[PDB]
Design a protein around this ligand. Sequence first.
Ligand SMILES: O=C(O)CNC(=O)C(=O)O
Ligand SMILES: [Mg+2]
Ligand code: NI
Ligand SMILES: [Zn+2]
Length: 331
Amino acid sequence: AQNPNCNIMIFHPTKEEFNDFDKYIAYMESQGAHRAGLAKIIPPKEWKARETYDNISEILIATPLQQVASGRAGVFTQYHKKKKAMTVGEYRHLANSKKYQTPPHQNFEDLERKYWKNRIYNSPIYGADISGSLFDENTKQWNLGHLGTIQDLLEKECGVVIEGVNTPYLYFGMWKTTFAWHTEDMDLYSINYLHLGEPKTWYVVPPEHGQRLERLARELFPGSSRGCGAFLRHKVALISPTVLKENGIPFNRITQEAGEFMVTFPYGYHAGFNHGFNCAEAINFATPRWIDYGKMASQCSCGEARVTFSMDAFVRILQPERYDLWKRGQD
Ligand SMILES: O=C(O)CNC(=O)C(=O)O
Ligand SMILES: [Mg+2]
Ligand code: NI
Ligand SMILES: [Zn+2]
């Protein structure tokens, strides 16, 4: 069995290997990359996502989210307070202000220490989940707005034609902006490209050990667990590496820099934080290997997780028993 310790693998495809996205994902899995839950892909040196980022400041962040924490430094939840709209140029200036800027630090490890020590005492503002793309239309390789759609994958594998669409999302981050522990909707893959700016640190649990993380989360967030049998779908809970180590939960960590792709694999729980002002683009995708994960994915029916139009069909076709209850949650 390849990669039996479930280490995060890093790939350096050549320009020729970067042509066929599906084939390269299948290659990485042949080497065991999925066992970690997360892989890094460094694009060939010839490739670029677009020519420059000099003209992005007029993108609108219609609903910036202030991420307010509650709990203790290593075990906390965050809620998202909606703020007034601002442009990317306004948000960059805000990120760079004395109130929000990255503190002086020695290296990524020192910054990581400072994040876990101090995150809860601040409320950084995240421009998350903005439909759109920064890939140039002429970028033909690994262009996250030109991928094969999940609806077309389900149709190719299972024969059933369904409604729905699959488009990318932009994320504008600042120091301490945080993504809570989660798997993707319907335990899909994700791909994330860091277009510009400061790094993003990731934590990930191997898919084969995801239920260990769930059990810990039920112990650490006991009211939330009674409220919902899949409350990590709410995407609000954080658990530090120190706490994970104290409770024996297998995980790994890596830092993504500008110009790098990350892939998350089905049922790979992940969480992380931004080091400073940055912009990422991410989208869900599927392969044939996902279908079995999609059929088994948990679901939130308490009403909190509220998701896209396109997840309806996935539930309806892959999980017809759960459909009725899940749709009640959505309505
Ligand atoms: O970058 C972020 O804030 C969160 N991204 C993801 O969870 C992802 O790409 O799957
Ligand atoms: Mg602009
Ligand atoms: Ni994710
Ligand atoms: Zn729920």
